[PDB]
Amino acid sequence: TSPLLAPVRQIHAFGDSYSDNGESQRLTREMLAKGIAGAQALPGEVYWQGRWSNGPTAVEVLARQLGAQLADHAVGGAKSGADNYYGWMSAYRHTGLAGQVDAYLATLDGKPVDGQALHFIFVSANDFFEHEDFAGEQPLEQLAGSSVANIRAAVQRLGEAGARRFLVVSSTDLSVVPAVVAGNRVERAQRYLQAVNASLPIQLAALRKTRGLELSWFDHLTFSRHLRRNPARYGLVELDAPCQPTQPSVRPACANPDQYYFWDEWHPTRRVHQLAGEAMAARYAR
């Protein structure tokens, strides 16, 4: 192993439901109040305090582990580009990674970017979900290319504005997500996530060197493969069934959520987010 990275006192997080700590709930309440066509309350009733889980997301745990404050810009459903899985959102706000970066940089209020803040990026799953659910035409190899390009451009744009420090999370293992299994889409997920996770770290390594950035890459796939191969070691029992079923309809939650991998058909439990946040904190000194 190499030396731990310097401590972190401020995180700015950009991403999707795997990071959101209340933005989709705030924003959808605003959209409902304004009467925006097609709006829905997200995430819904069977979720903890606006998180798309039964507890804090991995980046919230990472912030606690590192002794950092967290500004969490992530929005449930966010894609790697400008917009969201929920297309009805775009009329009100661009909540994809690109839109989160735009809003972050447009709300500095004449102040510089903090060159010591960790810019945390965790996105791409909705690129895939949207493609599969609404028959995107791009072959999956092209979709992966566009996800990679979008994330690289976000880092470039953040660095351009003064950001120096980044943690970029890989694709998660979309191939074991309950909704993907139910969709019979395991192979498609495998192919998409391997293409993103092969190309993205190569692109970020080039950019890190060019622009003199500190950029950590977190391999969420390696992380989840290790949990799922040795579940008892982590106190996990159920790897496949959602604790809180929502498809086709909501049913009562399991009694033992801390022994479940998945909360609903797409999102991990608070326990898995805890292990993920701890894992992500491993490259940094407290």
PDB file of C-alpha atoms in Angstrom:
ATOM      1  CA  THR A   1       0.000   0.000   0.000  1.00  0.00           C
ATOM      2  CA  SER A   2       0.967   3.681  -0.484  1.00  0.00           C
ATOM      3  CA  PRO A   3       0.708   6.655   1.907  1.00  0.00           C
ATOM      4  CA  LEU A   4      -2.762   7.733   2.977  1.00  0.00           C
ATOM      5  CA  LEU A   5      -4.053  10.933   1.401  1.00  0.00           C
ATOM      6  CA  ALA A   6      -4.330  14.175   3.357  1.00  0.00           C
ATOM      7  CA  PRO A   7      -7.332  14.707   5.679  1.00  0.00           C
ATOM      8  CA  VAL A   8     -10.666  16.065   4.404  1.00  0.00           C
ATOM      9  CA  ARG A   9     -12.680  18.786   6.140  1.00  0.00           C
ATOM     10  CA  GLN A  10     -15.269  19.538   3.382  1.00  0.00           C
ATOM     11  CA  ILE A  11     -16.896  17.266   0.798  1.00  0.00           C
ATOM     12  CA  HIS A  12     -18.941  18.394  -2.146  1.00  0.00           C
ATOM     13  CA  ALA A  13     -20.854  15.342  -3.407  1.00  0.00           C
ATOM     14  CA  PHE A  14     -22.323  14.923  -6.902  1.00  0.00           C
ATOM     15  CA  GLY A  15     -24.386  11.894  -7.914  1.00  0.00           C
ATOM     16  CA  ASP A  16     -27.589   9.935  -7.822  1.00  0.00           C
ATOM     17  CA  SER A  17     -29.783   7.948  -5.288  1.00  0.00           C
ATOM     18  CA  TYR A  18     -26.647   6.166  -4.077  1.00  0.00           C
ATOM     19  CA  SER A  19     -25.537   9.536  -2.485  1.00  0.00           C
ATOM     20  CA  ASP A  20     -28.694  11.828  -2.247  1.00  0.00           C
ATOM     21  CA  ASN A  21     -29.341  12.916   1.369  1.00  0.00           C
ATOM     22  CA  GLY A  22     -32.583  14.840   0.772  1.00  0.00           C
ATOM     23  CA  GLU A  23     -32.326  16.813  -2.551  1.00  0.00           C
ATOM     24  CA  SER A  24     -34.789  14.689  -4.560  1.00  0.00           C
ATOM     25  CA  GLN A  25     -37.312  15.030  -1.701  1.00  0.00           C
ATOM     26  CA  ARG A  26     -36.828  18.833  -1.444  1.00  0.00           C
ATOM     27  CA  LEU A  27     -36.937  19.278  -5.243  1.00  0.00           C
ATOM     28  CA  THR A  28     -39.941  17.041  -5.905  1.00  0.00           C
ATOM     29  CA  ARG A  29     -41.890  18.830  -3.115  1.00  0.00           C
ATOM     30  CA  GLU A  30     -41.076  22.110  -4.910  1.00  0.00           C
ATOM     31  CA  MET A  31     -42.118  20.678  -8.247  1.00  0.00           C
ATOM     32  CA  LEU A  32     -45.405  19.304  -6.824  1.00  0.00           C
ATOM     33  CA  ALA A  33     -46.191  22.739  -5.276  1.00  0.00           C
ATOM     34  CA  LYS A  34     -45.586  24.442  -8.621  1.00  0.00           C
ATOM     35  CA  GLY A  35     -47.889  21.906 -10.400  1.00  0.00           C
ATOM     36  CA  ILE A  36     -45.156  20.537 -12.670  1.00  0.00           C
ATOM     37  CA  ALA A  37     -46.620  18.036 -15.099  1.00  0.00           C
ATOM     38  CA  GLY A  38     -45.886  14.381 -14.147  1.00  0.00           C
ATOM     39  CA  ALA A  39     -44.220  15.178 -10.838  1.00  0.00           C
ATOM     40  CA  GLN A  40     -44.194  12.577  -8.058  1.00  0.00           C
ATOM     41  CA  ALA A  41     -43.094  12.727  -4.421  1.00  0.00           C
ATOM     42  CA  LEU A  42     -39.640  11.069  -4.267  1.00  0.00           C
ATOM     43  CA  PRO A  43     -38.372   8.940  -2.798  1.00  0.00           C
ATOM     44  CA  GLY A  44     -41.677   8.063  -1.091  1.00  0.00           C
ATOM     45  CA  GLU A  45     -43.047   6.798   2.194  1.00  0.00           C
ATOM     46  CA  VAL A  46     -40.961   3.624   2.759  1.00  0.00           C
ATOM     47  CA  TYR A  47     -37.628   5.511   2.919  1.00  0.00           C
ATOM     48  CA  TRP A  48     -35.603   7.050   5.766  1.00  0.00           C
ATOM     49  CA  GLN A  49     -35.637  10.870   5.950  1.00  0.00           C
ATOM     50  CA  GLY A  50     -35.582  11.437   2.145  1.00  0.00           C
ATOM     51  CA  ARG A  51     -32.688   9.019   1.507  1.00  0.00           C
ATOM     52  CA  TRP A  52     -33.313   6.234  -1.039  1.00  0.00           C
ATOM     53  CA  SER A  53     -32.506   3.692   1.642  1.00  0.00           C
ATOM     54  CA  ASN A  54     -33.341   2.942   5.312  1.00  0.00           C
ATOM     55  CA  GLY A  55     -30.432   5.060   6.522  1.00  0.00           C
ATOM     56  CA  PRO A  56     -27.536   7.409   5.591  1.00  0.00           C
ATOM     57  CA  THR A  57     -25.851   6.995   2.199  1.00  0.00           C
ATOM     58  CA  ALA A  58     -22.220   5.972   1.749  1.00  0.00           C
ATOM     59  CA  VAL A  59     -20.967   9.558   1.256  1.00  0.00           C
ATOM     60  CA  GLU A  60     -22.704  10.631   4.539  1.00  0.00           C
ATOM     61  CA  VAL A  61     -20.792   7.830   6.285  1.00  0.00           C
ATOM     62  CA  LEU A  62     -17.568   8.832   4.514  1.00  0.00           C
ATOM     63  CA  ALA A  63     -18.001  12.409   5.789  1.00  0.00           C
ATOM     64  CA  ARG A  64     -18.453  11.134   9.368  1.00  0.00           C
ATOM     65  CA  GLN A  65     -15.475   8.818   9.129  1.00  0.00           C
ATOM     66  CA  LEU A  66     -13.198  11.583   7.862  1.00  0.00           C
ATOM     67  CA  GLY A  67     -14.434  14.397  10.127  1.00  0.00           C
ATOM     68  CA  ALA A  68     -15.698  16.436   7.136  1.00  0.00           C
ATOM     69  CA  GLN A  69     -18.728  18.580   6.608  1.00  0.00           C
ATOM     70  CA  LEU A  70     -20.860  17.435   3.643  1.00  0.00           C
ATOM     71  CA  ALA A  71     -22.587  19.534   0.956  1.00  0.00           C
ATOM     72  CA  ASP A  72     -24.550  16.804  -0.840  1.00  0.00           C
ATOM     73  CA  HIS A  73     -25.716  17.995  -4.320  1.00  0.00           C
ATOM     74  CA  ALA A  74     -26.724  14.498  -5.475  1.00  0.00           C
ATOM     75  CA  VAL A  75     -30.259  13.982  -6.751  1.00  0.00           C
ATOM     76  CA  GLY A  76     -32.042  10.666  -7.022  1.00  0.00           C
ATOM     77  CA  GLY A  77     -32.367   9.568 -10.664  1.00  0.00           C
ATOM     78  CA  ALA A  78     -29.431  11.765 -11.831  1.00  0.00           C
ATOM     79  CA  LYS A  79     -27.677  10.707 -15.088  1.00  0.00           C
ATOM     80  CA  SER A  80     -24.093  11.508 -15.966  1.00  0.00           C
ATOM     81  CA  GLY A  81     -25.165  14.319 -18.351  1.00  0.00           C
ATOM     82  CA  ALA A  82     -27.566  17.266 -17.751  1.00  0.00           C
ATOM     83  CA  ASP A  83     -30.763  15.459 -16.810  1.00  0.00           C
ATOM     84  CA  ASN A  84     -32.529  12.791 -14.796  1.00  0.00           C
ATOM     85  CA  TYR A  85     -34.134   9.365 -15.270  1.00  0.00           C
ATOM     86  CA  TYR A  86     -37.318  11.325 -14.456  1.00  0.00           C
ATOM     87  CA  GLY A  87     -37.701  13.294 -17.634  1.00  0.00           C
ATOM     88  CA  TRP A  88     -40.448  15.480 -16.143  1.00  0.00           C
ATOM     89  CA  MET A  89     -37.807  17.139 -13.946  1.00  0.00           C
ATOM     90  CA  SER A  90     -35.970  18.875 -16.817  1.00  0.00           C
ATOM     91  CA  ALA A  91     -38.642  21.632 -17.267  1.00  0.00           C
ATOM     92  CA  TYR A  92     -37.888  22.780 -13.675  1.00  0.00           C
ATOM     93  CA  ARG A  93     -34.186  21.883 -13.129  1.00  0.00           C
ATOM     94  CA  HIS A  94     -31.288  19.986 -14.800  1.00  0.00           C
ATOM     95  CA  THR A  95     -30.409  17.551 -12.014  1.00  0.00           C
ATOM     96  CA  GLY A  96     -27.917  15.269 -13.799  1.00  0.00           C
ATOM     97  CA  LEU A  97     -24.239  15.404 -12.809  1.00  0.00           C
ATOM     98  CA  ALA A  98     -23.606  18.185 -15.410  1.00  0.00           C
ATOM     99  CA  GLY A  99     -26.508  20.256 -13.961  1.00  0.00           C
ATOM    100  CA  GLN A 100     -25.273  19.715 -10.377  1.00  0.00           C
ATOM    101  CA  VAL A 101     -21.818  20.950 -11.423  1.00  0.00           C
ATOM    102  CA  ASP A 102     -23.351  23.995 -13.151  1.00  0.00           C
ATOM    103  CA  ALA A 103     -25.406  24.878 -10.073  1.00  0.00           C
ATOM    104  CA  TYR A 104     -22.449  24.367  -7.701  1.00  0.00           C
ATOM    105  CA  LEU A 105     -20.280  26.719  -9.732  1.00  0.00           C
ATOM    106  CA  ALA A 106     -23.062  29.278 -10.232  1.00  0.00           C
ATOM    107  CA  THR A 107     -23.791  29.494  -6.476  1.00  0.00           C
ATOM    108  CA  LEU A 108     -20.235  30.232  -5.226  1.00  0.00           C
ATOM    109  CA  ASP A 109     -21.323  33.869  -4.668  1.00  0.00           C
ATOM    110  CA  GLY A 110     -18.020  35.437  -5.872  1.00  0.00           C
ATOM    111  CA  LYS A 111     -15.977  33.076  -3.655  1.00  0.00           C
ATOM    112  CA  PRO A 112     -13.279  30.739  -4.901  1.00  0.00           C
ATOM    113  CA  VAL A 113     -13.744  26.988  -5.107  1.00  0.00           C
ATOM    114  CA  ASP A 114     -12.182  25.387  -2.032  1.00  0.00           C
ATOM    115  CA  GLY A 115      -9.022  23.711  -3.326  1.00  0.00           C
ATOM    116  CA  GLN A 116      -8.931  21.596  -0.177  1.00  0.00           C
ATOM    117  CA  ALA A 117     -12.516  20.290  -0.478  1.00  0.00           C
ATOM    118  CA  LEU A 118     -12.990  16.739  -1.747  1.00  0.00           C
ATOM    119  CA  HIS A 119     -15.218  16.665  -4.871  1.00  0.00           C
ATOM    120  CA  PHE A 120     -16.980  13.324  -4.675  1.00  0.00           C
ATOM    121  CA  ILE A 121     -18.611  11.988  -7.878  1.00  0.00           C
ATOM    122  CA  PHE A 122     -20.805   8.862  -7.893  1.00  0.00           C
ATOM    123  CA  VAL A 123     -23.022   8.480 -10.992  1.00  0.00           C
ATOM    124  CA  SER A 124     -23.852   6.385 -14.111  1.00  0.00           C
ATOM    125  CA  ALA A 125     -26.432   3.795 -12.984  1.00  0.00           C
ATOM    126  CA  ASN A 126     -29.379   5.945 -14.293  1.00  0.00           C
ATOM    127  CA  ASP A 127     -27.733   6.121 -17.739  1.00  0.00           C
ATOM    128  CA  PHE A 128     -28.226   2.358 -17.877  1.00  0.00           C
ATOM    129  CA  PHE A 129     -31.675   2.227 -16.191  1.00  0.00           C
ATOM    130  CA  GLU A 130     -33.007   4.885 -18.547  1.00  0.00           C
ATOM    131  CA  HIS A 131     -31.536   3.135 -21.601  1.00  0.00           C
ATOM    132  CA  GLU A 132     -33.094  -0.207 -20.668  1.00  0.00           C
ATOM    133  CA  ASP A 133     -36.456   1.132 -19.456  1.00  0.00           C
ATOM    134  CA  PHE A 134     -37.174   3.455 -22.361  1.00  0.00           C
ATOM    135  CA  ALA A 135     -35.423   1.536 -25.207  1.00  0.00           C
ATOM    136  CA  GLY A 136     -32.430   3.757 -25.744  1.00  0.00           C
ATOM    137  CA  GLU A 137     -30.979   3.118 -29.194  1.00  0.00           C
ATOM    138  CA  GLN A 138     -27.252   3.548 -28.456  1.00  0.00           C
ATOM    139  CA  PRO A 139     -25.459   0.187 -28.280  1.00  0.00           C
ATOM    140  CA  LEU A 140     -24.322  -0.391 -24.683  1.00  0.00           C
ATOM    141  CA  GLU A 141     -20.648   0.114 -25.585  1.00  0.00           C
ATOM    142  CA  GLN A 142     -21.561   3.636 -26.919  1.00  0.00           C
ATOM    143  CA  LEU A 143     -23.712   4.351 -23.819  1.00  0.00           C
ATOM    144  CA  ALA A 144     -20.702   3.424 -21.586  1.00  0.00           C
ATOM    145  CA  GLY A 145     -18.489   5.713 -23.701  1.00  0.00           C
ATOM    146  CA  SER A 146     -20.890   8.608 -23.178  1.00  0.00           C
ATOM    147  CA  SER A 147     -21.108   7.953 -19.380  1.00  0.00           C
ATOM    148  CA  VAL A 148     -17.298   7.959 -19.227  1.00  0.00           C
ATOM    149  CA  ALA A 149     -17.044  11.146 -21.246  1.00  0.00           C
ATOM    150  CA  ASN A 150     -19.662  12.882 -19.092  1.00  0.00           C
ATOM    151  CA  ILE A 151     -17.871  12.041 -15.846  1.00  0.00           C
ATOM    152  CA  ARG A 152     -14.483  13.044 -17.243  1.00  0.00           C
ATOM    153  CA  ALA A 153     -15.972  16.365 -18.396  1.00  0.00           C
ATOM    154  CA  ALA A 154     -17.415  16.971 -14.908  1.00  0.00           C
ATOM    155  CA  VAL A 155     -14.000  16.532 -13.330  1.00  0.00           C
ATOM    156  CA  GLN A 156     -12.442  18.764 -16.041  1.00  0.00           C
ATOM    157  CA  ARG A 157     -15.051  21.495 -15.468  1.00  0.00           C
ATOM    158  CA  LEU A 158     -14.679  21.322 -11.667  1.00  0.00           C
ATOM    159  CA  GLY A 159     -10.856  21.490 -11.941  1.00  0.00           C
ATOM    160  CA  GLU A 160     -11.112  24.339 -14.450  1.00  0.00           C
ATOM    161  CA  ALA A 161     -13.004  26.327 -11.806  1.00  0.00           C
ATOM    162  CA  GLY A 162     -10.415  25.599  -9.033  1.00  0.00           C
ATOM    163  CA  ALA A 163     -11.199  22.123  -7.607  1.00  0.00           C
ATOM    164  CA  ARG A 164      -8.036  20.094  -6.880  1.00  0.00           C
ATOM    165  CA  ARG A 165      -9.222  17.022  -4.975  1.00  0.00           C
ATOM    166  CA  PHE A 166     -11.589  14.292  -6.218  1.00  0.00           C
ATOM    167  CA  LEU A 167     -12.957  10.882  -5.273  1.00  0.00           C
ATOM    168  CA  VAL A 168     -14.705   9.198  -8.194  1.00  0.00           C
ATOM    169  CA  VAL A 169     -16.750   6.077  -7.597  1.00  0.00           C
ATOM    170  CA  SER A 170     -16.912   3.331 -10.252  1.00  0.00           C
ATOM    171  CA  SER A 171     -20.070   1.810 -11.636  1.00  0.00           C
ATOM    172  CA  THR A 172     -21.700  -0.296  -8.971  1.00  0.00           C
ATOM    173  CA  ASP A 173     -22.501  -3.954  -9.767  1.00  0.00           C
ATOM    174  CA  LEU A 174     -25.716  -3.266 -11.675  1.00  0.00           C
ATOM    175  CA  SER A 175     -25.759  -7.006 -12.638  1.00  0.00           C
ATOM    176  CA  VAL A 176     -26.981  -8.015  -9.132  1.00  0.00           C
ATOM    177  CA  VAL A 177     -29.517  -5.256  -8.640  1.00  0.00           C
ATOM    178  CA  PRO A 178     -32.893  -6.973  -7.992  1.00  0.00           C
ATOM    179  CA  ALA A 179     -34.673  -4.950 -10.707  1.00  0.00           C
ATOM    180  CA  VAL A 180     -32.045  -5.931 -13.269  1.00  0.00           C
ATOM    181  CA  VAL A 181     -32.335  -9.623 -12.315  1.00  0.00           C
ATOM    182  CA  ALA A 182     -36.152  -9.392 -12.580  1.00  0.00           C
ATOM    183  CA  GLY A 183     -35.696  -7.645 -15.987  1.00  0.00           C
ATOM    184  CA  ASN A 184     -33.532 -10.595 -17.171  1.00  0.00           C
ATOM    185  CA  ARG A 185     -30.860  -7.942 -17.956  1.00  0.00           C
ATOM    186  CA  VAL A 186     -27.860  -9.380 -15.996  1.00  0.00           C
ATOM    187  CA  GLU A 187     -25.607  -9.800 -19.095  1.00  0.00           C
ATOM    188  CA  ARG A 188     -26.423  -6.321 -20.396  1.00  0.00           C
ATOM    189  CA  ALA A 189     -25.542  -4.811 -16.989  1.00  0.00           C
ATOM    190  CA  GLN A 190     -22.283  -6.823 -16.879  1.00  0.00           C
ATOM    191  CA  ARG A 191     -21.277  -5.542 -20.294  1.00  0.00           C
ATOM    192  CA  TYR A 192     -22.148  -1.921 -19.572  1.00  0.00           C
ATOM    193  CA  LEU A 193     -20.486  -1.771 -16.145  1.00  0.00           C
ATOM    194  CA  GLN A 194     -17.275  -3.490 -17.391  1.00  0.00           C
ATOM    195  CA  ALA A 195     -16.965  -0.999 -20.233  1.00  0.00           C
ATOM    196  CA  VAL A 196     -17.387   1.991 -17.901  1.00  0.00           C
ATOM    197  CA  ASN A 197     -15.012   0.583 -15.199  1.00  0.00           C
ATOM    198  CA  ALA A 198     -12.263  -0.329 -17.739  1.00  0.00           C
ATOM    199  CA  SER A 199     -12.266   3.084 -19.488  1.00  0.00           C
ATOM    200  CA  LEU A 200     -13.083   5.634 -16.732  1.00  0.00           C
ATOM    201  CA  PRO A 201     -10.030   5.155 -14.485  1.00  0.00           C
ATOM    202  CA  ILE A 202      -7.740   5.400 -17.554  1.00  0.00           C
ATOM    203  CA  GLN A 203      -9.332   8.719 -18.539  1.00  0.00           C
ATOM    204  CA  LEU A 204      -9.184  10.105 -14.952  1.00  0.00           C
ATOM    205  CA  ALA A 205      -5.524   9.079 -14.528  1.00  0.00           C
ATOM    206  CA  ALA A 206      -4.620  11.155 -17.693  1.00  0.00           C
ATOM    207  CA  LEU A 207      -6.637  14.150 -16.481  1.00  0.00           C
ATOM    208  CA  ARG A 208      -5.256  13.894 -12.903  1.00  0.00           C
ATOM    209  CA  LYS A 209      -1.714  14.130 -14.261  1.00  0.00           C
ATOM    210  CA  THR A 210      -2.433  16.887 -16.790  1.00  0.00           C
ATOM    211  CA  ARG A 211      -4.232  19.208 -14.342  1.00  0.00           C
ATOM    212  CA  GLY A 212      -2.265  18.334 -11.178  1.00  0.00           C
ATOM    213  CA  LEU A 213      -5.201  16.848  -9.326  1.00  0.00           C
ATOM    214  CA  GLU A 214      -5.437  14.466  -6.419  1.00  0.00           C
ATOM    215  CA  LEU A 215      -7.964  11.940  -7.716  1.00  0.00           C
ATOM    216  CA  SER A 216      -8.866   8.726  -5.917  1.00  0.00           C
ATOM    217  CA  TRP A 217     -10.752   6.004  -7.769  1.00  0.00           C
ATOM    218  CA  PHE A 218     -13.089   3.809  -5.667  1.00  0.00           C
ATOM    219  CA  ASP A 219     -13.866   0.393  -7.180  1.00  0.00           C
ATOM    220  CA  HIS A 220     -17.345  -0.304  -5.894  1.00  0.00           C
ATOM    221  CA  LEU A 221     -17.513  -3.503  -7.939  1.00  0.00           C
ATOM    222  CA  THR A 222     -14.501  -5.015  -6.159  1.00  0.00           C
ATOM    223  CA  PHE A 223     -15.976  -3.824  -2.867  1.00  0.00           C
ATOM    224  CA  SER A 224     -19.412  -5.485  -3.479  1.00  0.00           C
ATOM    225  CA  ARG A 225     -17.852  -8.676  -4.864  1.00  0.00           C
ATOM    226  CA  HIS A 226     -15.910  -9.074  -1.624  1.00  0.00           C
ATOM    227  CA  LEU A 227     -19.008  -8.494   0.567  1.00  0.00           C
ATOM    228  CA  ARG A 228     -21.197 -10.856  -1.440  1.00  0.00           C
ATOM    229  CA  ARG A 229     -18.614 -13.652  -1.539  1.00  0.00           C
ATOM    230  CA  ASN A 230     -18.143 -13.586   2.291  1.00  0.00           C
ATOM    231  CA  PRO A 231     -21.498 -12.235   3.581  1.00  0.00           C
ATOM    232  CA  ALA A 232     -21.429 -13.797   7.123  1.00  0.00           C
ATOM    233  CA  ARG A 233     -18.170 -12.025   7.917  1.00  0.00           C
ATOM    234  CA  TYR A 234     -20.142  -8.727   7.559  1.00  0.00           C
ATOM    235  CA  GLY A 235     -23.296  -9.993   9.295  1.00  0.00           C
ATOM    236  CA  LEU A 236     -25.216 -10.208   5.982  1.00  0.00           C
ATOM    237  CA  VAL A 237     -27.704 -12.996   5.343  1.00  0.00           C
ATOM    238  CA  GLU A 238     -29.975 -11.968   2.400  1.00  0.00           C
ATOM    239  CA  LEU A 239     -28.137 -10.794  -0.729  1.00  0.00           C
ATOM    240  CA  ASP A 240     -30.953 -10.867  -3.308  1.00  0.00           C
ATOM    241  CA  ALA A 241     -34.375 -10.089  -1.872  1.00  0.00           C
ATOM    242  CA  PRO A 242     -35.226  -6.486  -1.142  1.00  0.00           C
ATOM    243  CA  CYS A 243     -35.945  -5.850   2.546  1.00  0.00           C
ATOM    244  CA  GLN A 244     -38.619  -3.319   1.481  1.00  0.00           C
ATOM    245  CA  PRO A 245     -40.445  -4.559  -1.642  1.00  0.00           C
ATOM    246  CA  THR A 246     -41.934  -1.772  -3.829  1.00  0.00           C
ATOM    247  CA  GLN A 247     -42.495  -3.620  -7.199  1.00  0.00           C
ATOM    248  CA  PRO A 248     -45.143  -4.211  -8.362  1.00  0.00           C
ATOM    249  CA  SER A 249     -46.382  -2.783  -5.022  1.00  0.00           C
ATOM    250  CA  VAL A 250     -45.230  -1.853  -1.565  1.00  0.00           C
ATOM    251  CA  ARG A 251     -45.276  -4.689   0.980  1.00  0.00           C
ATOM    252  CA  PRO A 252     -44.173  -4.852   4.629  1.00  0.00           C
ATOM    253  CA  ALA A 253     -40.404  -4.521   5.307  1.00  0.00           C
ATOM    254  CA  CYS A 254     -38.254  -7.343   6.612  1.00  0.00           C
ATOM    255  CA  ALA A 255     -37.647  -7.426  10.398  1.00  0.00           C
ATOM    256  CA  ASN A 256     -33.828  -7.626  10.114  1.00  0.00           C
ATOM    257  CA  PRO A 257     -32.694  -4.932   7.617  1.00  0.00           C
ATOM    258  CA  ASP A 258     -29.097  -4.871   8.870  1.00  0.00           C
ATOM    259  CA  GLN A 259     -28.703  -8.428   7.553  1.00  0.00           C
ATOM    260  CA  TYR A 260     -29.961  -7.397   4.020  1.00  0.00           C
ATOM    261  CA  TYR A 261     -27.889  -6.164   1.084  1.00  0.00           C
ATOM    262  CA  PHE A 262     -30.765  -4.460  -0.701  1.00  0.00           C
ATOM    263  CA  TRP A 263     -33.351  -2.108   0.733  1.00  0.00           C
ATOM    264  CA  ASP A 264     -35.574  -1.863  -2.396  1.00  0.00           C
ATOM    265  CA  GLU A 265     -35.156  -3.281  -5.930  1.00  0.00           C
ATOM    266  CA  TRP A 266     -32.307  -0.786  -6.834  1.00  0.00           C
ATOM    267  CA  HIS A 267     -30.737   0.577  -3.640  1.00  0.00           C
ATOM    268  CA  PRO A 268     -28.568  -0.900  -0.869  1.00  0.00           C
ATOM    269  CA  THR A 269     -29.478  -0.863   2.840  1.00  0.00           C
ATOM    270  CA  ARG A 270     -28.003   1.453   5.409  1.00  0.00           C
ATOM    271  CA  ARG A 271     -25.709  -1.421   6.448  1.00  0.00           C
ATOM    272  CA  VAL A 272     -24.191  -1.716   2.953  1.00  0.00           C
ATOM    273  CA  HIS A 273     -23.902   2.079   2.680  1.00  0.00           C
ATOM    274  CA  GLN A 274     -22.020   1.998   6.051  1.00  0.00           C
ATOM    275  CA  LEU A 275     -19.550  -0.616   4.830  1.00  0.00           C
ATOM    276  CA  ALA A 276     -19.211   1.324   1.527  1.00  0.00           C
ATOM    277  CA  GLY A 277     -18.496   4.644   3.316  1.00  0.00           C
ATOM    278  CA  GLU A 278     -15.950   2.994   5.561  1.00  0.00           C
ATOM    279  CA  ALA A 279     -14.274   1.411   2.499  1.00  0.00           C
ATOM    280  CA  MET A 280     -14.202   4.768   0.717  1.00  0.00           C
ATOM    281  CA  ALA A 281     -12.624   6.425   3.774  1.00  0.00           C
ATOM    282  CA  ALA A 282      -9.718   3.893   3.675  1.00  0.00           C
ATOM    283  CA  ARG A 283      -7.497   5.935   1.284  1.00  0.00           C
ATOM    284  CA  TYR A 284      -7.532   9.071   3.588  1.00  0.00           C
ATOM    285  CA  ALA A 285      -6.088  10.044   6.977  1.00  0.00           C
ATOM    286  CA  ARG A 286      -8.615  11.277   9.571  1.00  0.00           C
TER     287      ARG A 286
END
